[model samples]
Target: MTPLLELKDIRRSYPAGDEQVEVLKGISLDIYAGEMVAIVGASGSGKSTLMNILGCLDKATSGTYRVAGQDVATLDADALAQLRREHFGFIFQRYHLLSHLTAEQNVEVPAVYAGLERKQRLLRAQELLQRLGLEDRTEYYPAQLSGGQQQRVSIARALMNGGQVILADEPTGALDSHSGEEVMAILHQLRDRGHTVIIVTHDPQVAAQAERVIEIRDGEIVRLEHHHH
Candidate 1:
């Protein structure tokens, strides 16, 4: 089968003091569905650039990106927005929850974007949070939940739009060890349930948890390792 998402010779550069500094140097990758993959690197290794491009948050300077067999460059603005909602989810280092919104309300934001009826949106938010073991905390504010609970709330929000691909950037970076492991477990289970999980992290232990690891250095892909299960 074709890869779920494919990138070929992707490059990103920015103008810096009359010199264009390249951040990603013609990187290529193929990510299949139902797999957990990690992109590991030191600071400024271009992993962030790659993930942002993968999630359509930014475009590459040169190269092709295909998601679900459609050329990204060929899509119009509306199609681009639809692509992000329909195909991908995002989890971040910080929870990014609105402090004023309760967990249920926060999770309902994306469903609202999808134009779900009020009842449907509310029910989905409640159900996903419950399914993720946050049933009791559904009505709590972001500040009221622990780090792990807030991240769980964020994951529930991600699934609100029926997203199958999850792009997580340093997901456990701000949590304690216990909370970090809790988040990792959820990510692994999502992969097992046929959702593609792509994580960008600097932690070796985080990279070790993935089925495959792609290592980048000095803006180039330096290694690709697949762990045998």
Candidate 2:
């Protein structure tokens, strides 16, 4: 069977003064449905850069990327944007919730962009927040909730589009151990439910949680380890 996501000879570079500094050097990998994978590396190791490309937030300077079975290299910016909105969900280290909106409202933001009617969006948001154990905090603002609750709200927002692939960048980086573990548990649950989850992290504990770990160094994939059940 074909993978849900595939990166073929992916290369990305950015301008560093007069020279172009290569970040991703021909990365090739595949992520199948229900897989929880971690990309780990130290500072300047290009793990975050690779995550950005994989999440459709940016494109590689060269090579091919197929996400949700669509050729990313062939897509124009508009097409790429649409693909991201439709195929992937993103969770950030910082809970990117709007301060003015309640948790439910924040979760409904993506559905608004997806052009869903207000009633439909609200219904879906309520269902997700409830399922994610945020039912009682639906009317709470980000500041009104605890860090773990805020992160759960963010997760609910990610599920607004019902995306099957979740791309998380340092999702538990800012939380306490207890909260971090809670976030990881939620991600694992999502994976168990058949969502392809990819995380970019520096924490070894976080890396250990994944079924497969890909290590990067100096802009290249230096090692890959699979932990089978």
Candidate 3:
């Protein structure tokens, strides 16, 4: 089967003032459609950098990245933005919501960029919130919601756009046990519905929930294993 995303000899570097710093050193991987993938690494091991590149939030310094067989390296910023908006959803450890915006409004940000009219965006947000069991919280601001509720809002926002690929970075780190399981359950449901879900996390329990684990160390893939939960 053709992979949904492919990274070949990927490398990312930064200029640390005077010296060159390489955050990701020649990483490579292929993620197929509907796969539940966990990328595990210690802090400072470049997993965050890898997730940024995977989600199209940043570009790699070298090597080829293909999504559905298109060469990503050839895309310009506008194209990349469109690509991300059209094909990926991102969840963050901090829930990344605008403090002042209501949950429904937060979920509509991507739809606005995706060019949906106001009514359509609002309706879409409402639908997702209801599905995520946050219907009553829609009008509430992020600050008023619990950690899990805010994360659900974030998920709703991510789904508003592509609803195709979900890239979560330490998505459950701040939640309690029950809440973390809820987030993971949503991910599994998304996968069951055929969305490609890739999670970047350090928690062993989180990794255990995945169908496969890719372990990174010192900016390199130390192991990639297929497993059953």
Candidate 4:
């Protein structure tokens, strides 16, 4: 089967004064559909940089990346933006919800960007929020919800565009243990439903939940461990 995402000799760097600081060296990997993979590494291990590239938030400095079968390296910013809106969903460590928007409204934002009619957007948003167990909190703003509830709302938003891949960076980092598990369960369900999930985390327990765990060090993938039940 064709992989949902592929990275070949991926390299990313940034200018540090006169010299360049390479965060990601030559990294390569393939992630298939319905798979949950964890990227684990220490701070400054370029995990975050790799996440950005996976999410199409930034292009790699060198090497090739294909997401959802499209060559991201060949796409311009507008094309990448379009791809992001169509094929990828993002969940961050911070919920990044609009404090002023209610949970349902927050999910609706992406649908609107996807050019869905207002009523269609509303219906889809309501359906996802309800399915995610946030029905009673539909009208609640971010500040009114607990951390777990906020994260669920964010997940609902991520599912708004019916994205095939969910790129999560430290998704449970800010939550309590119980809340973190809840979020992970939701992501597992997403995988079961055939959405590819790529998570960047430092927690061994969390990494263990994934079908595959990739360890990055000094900007390179040093090890890859697979766990199959």
In model 3, pairs of residues that clash are none
Q: Cα lDDT of all candidates, in order?
A: 0.91, 0.89, 0.90, 0.90
Question: What does the lDDT come to for candidate 1?
Answer: 0.91
Model 1, runs deviating above 4 Å: 16-18
Q: Mind giving the per-residue lDDT tens digits that candidate 3 earns over 99-183? A: 9899999999998877799999999899999999998898998878899988999999999986799999989889999998899
Error of 3 at 6 (Å): 0.5
**What TM-score, to 2 decimals, does candidate 2 have?**
0.96
lDDT of 1 by residue, 116-201 (tens): 89998999889999988999998999888888899999999888897699999999999999998889989888898999999999
Candidate 3 yields a Cα-based lDDT of 0.90
Candidates 1 and 4 compared: the better one by lDDT is 1
Q: What range of 10 consecutive residues in model 2 has the weakest lDDT sum?
A: 78-87
Which window of 10 residues has the lowest lDDT sum in candidate 4? 73-82
